Amino acid sequence: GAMESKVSFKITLTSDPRLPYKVLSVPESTPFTAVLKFAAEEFKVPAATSAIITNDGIGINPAQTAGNVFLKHGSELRIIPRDRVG
Amino acid sequence: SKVSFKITLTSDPRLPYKVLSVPESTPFTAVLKFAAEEFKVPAATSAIITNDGIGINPAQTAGNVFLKHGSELRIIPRD
């Protein structure tokens, strides 16, 4: 195919005891900010305040292709929504 | 063997881009079409140009396009 290879991530909402998840397949050249927004929406949580971290407690810099994240941290990611104030 | 292109939809202020690799013999018409489809804009009215404002004749091999203009191209959707 002419279309770029995809990498896939298993993103878990660890905050939910059920450990639900969504698998996203994403073009390697995609800025990770797009992946985070897409994931937040699938989980119905605010993209602007949520974060994606690795299973070993590293924060993922969103200014980074999906390819890089895949290559450096593999496919198991966690989505972290913020608490509320007051 | 394949050559690769970064095509940026510059009319989308988010500047989203896609990467395409096609066999260096591929007619550039195929890439224009492919790019159109992926970008969800009409192949018939879309153009592909370079960063420096040169229009790419699609009746050319992707290989030759790569050789003359490099990988950085813009897709220009009609009105």
């Binding site: 995809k6 896939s8 969504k22 698998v23 996203l24 397949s25 994403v26 073009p27 995609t30 800025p31 797009a34 992946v35 897409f38 699938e42 | 939809l9 989308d12 988010r14 989203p16 896609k18 992926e38």
Partner: peptide, 9 residues
Amino acid sequence: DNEWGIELV
């Protein structure tokens, strides 16, 4: 919009 072509699986 999904202008980066992300797919759910």
